[PDB]
Every structure is written in C-alpha cells, then in structure tokens.
Amino acid sequence: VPFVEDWDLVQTLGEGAYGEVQLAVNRVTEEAVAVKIVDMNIKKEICILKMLNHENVIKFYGHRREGNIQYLFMELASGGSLFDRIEPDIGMPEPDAQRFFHQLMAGVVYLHGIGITHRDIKPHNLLLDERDNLKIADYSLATVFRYNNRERLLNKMCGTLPYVAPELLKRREFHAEPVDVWSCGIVLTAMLAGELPWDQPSDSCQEYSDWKEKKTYLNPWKKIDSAPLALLHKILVENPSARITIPDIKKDRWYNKPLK
Ligand SMILES: Nc1ncnc2n[nH]cc12
Ligand SMILES: [Cl-]
C-alpha cells in the first residue's frame, strides 16, 4: 500500500483527468484526510486553496512535492457527493434541497467575497461531511475575478456544458459572478427534478428554447412546486445583467420558506 511521510493512502475517492484523490490516514494519530495526487498552472490552484477558510468550502491543510508528484492535503468529506443523494427522475425532498441550496449559497458568497470564482459548480463538486454539510470542492478551474477591489472580466470558456451560462457560449468577455449563480440554478433543478433541463443553453437546443418560451408544463419544470420554480425563473435568465444576484436570492419567497 502506498504512503506519504506519516500517511497511508488507503482507498480511492476520485480518479479523473487531474490525478487521483485518496483517503489518507495518519499511521500514529488515526486522523483521516483526502489527498490529491497530481503527476506533474497548479501553482495557481495551491495559491487559491491557501486562501480558503469557510465551513462550506473544502479546507487546504498543505502540500508536498516528491519528484514529479505533488500531494494536496485537504479536509475529508466522508458523506460522498450531492450527486449520490439525487434520485434520477425524482430529485430529493424539497426541505433537503432547500438546506443544501442555503449551504451552497453560503459557500459561493464566501468565494465571491474573496474575489474567487469556482467556474464548475455541479453535484459531483459538492461533497458532504459526516453530518451532511455541503462543501464546495475541486479548485482546478477556479480563478481570481477581483483583485485590489478591481473586477476583471473572464474570457476562457470552461465548466460543464449542461451547467454553463449562455453568455459563456455567446460573449467574448463576461462577468464571473452571474456564471456561478446560473450553475447553482441548474443544481437546484437537478435536486428538485432528478433531471437536467438541457444539454446546453444555446438557441440550437430545443429544451432551452422551450424554457425561454416558458413551457413549464413540460419536464423537468412540471415536477417543481410553484415557489422554487419562481426562483428558477429569476436565476435561469439569459441576460446576465438582468439575472438575480445572490443578495436578491436571499430575499426570495421559497429561499425563506420554512420546510419539514
Ligand atoms: N473527492 C473527495 N472526497 C472526499 N473528500 C474530499 N476532499 N477533497 C476532495 C475530496
Ligand atoms: Cl441529475
């Protein structure tokens, strides 16, 4: 079994493009963490990770270089991902969706407030701790959009097509924050309907045209109660300057609705 200084690498938690994530257990102390193994722009990622200090963001513990392999030591989320709590075609109980949405907003407000954009919010990147607390994970596409109190526009296209905002397909440069707000709306849809609304938010996508023409008698919208659906009408707005901001999400009727 492989090992790094005092830690054993006991099991795989993620095996993707950007290396593997392992469960690491300190042989002496029994402390369990997560370790990302990169087989060597990760200087950027580490710099962003060291900024992160919030209950709804995965904490960074530190790193070790050993030849051409870096080890990123991060808070373990033993509960798996939001992806695993979504029943296909069903979603999850509205009160659980609302609580996860509250936590996702707390995390995103935090990141925006230190001028960080995640750029790939989706259920695989939203991990759960042992008490089902949501943690925003995977900062490999994250970037700075505000420095010295000056906003910079993004122009790199990235993320995951079903989750990306339409401006990212249509504009040369765009604001970072409304792109993360949009992806949070697609996550809320997935939680309440167990179904993604469209392959991509382009005029060539029939399901996306249906939404802009307000055909909410179709799936996934006909599975969603009128209150959360009124919030999705304010989030999934094609013009990013008319899209609801997080301050205004926090004033929404469903957002503030007491639930089971
Ligand atoms: N993929 C992952 N699984 C569990 N905990 C983690 N923390 N950072 C990434 C993780
Ligand atoms: Cl889904």
CA of 89 to the centre of ligand 2 (A): 8
CA of 212 to the centre of ligand 2 (A): 21
Which residues carry out catalysis? 120
Helix/strand/coil (H/E/C) assignment for every residue in 98-143: HHHHHHHHHHHHHHHHCCEECCCCCHHHEEECCCCCEEECCCCCCE
Contact criterion met (CB below 8 Å) for 202 and 166: yes
Which method, experimentally, gave rise to this model? X-ray
Q: Return the number of other C-beta atoms located less than 10 Å from residue 1's C-beta.
A: 6
* Ligand 1 residue neighbourhood (C-beta within 6 Å): 13-14, 21, 34, 58, 74-77, 127, 137
Beta-carbon contacts of 122 under 8 Å, excluding residues fewer than 6 positions away, are: 160, 162, 163, 183, 186, 187
16 carries a ligand binding annotation? yes
Compute CA 141 distance to the chain's CA centroid, rounded to the nearest angstrom: 11
- Say whether 170 sits in a helix, a strand or coil: helix
What Å distances lie between residue 6 and 9, 35, 59, 205, CA to CA?
A: 10, 13, 20, 52
CA of 105 to the centre of ligand 2 (A): 19
Contact criterion met (CB below 8 Å) for 227 and 95: no
Give, for ligand 1, the residue of 35, 73, 74 to mutate: max count of ligand atoms closer than 8 Å to Cβ.
74
| 191 HSE (CA, 13 A, CB side) | 26
Matching residue, tokens 């080890």: 71
Q: What angle do CA 100, 152, 255 make, to 5 degrees?
A: 20
Domain boundaries, the chain: 1-87, 88-260
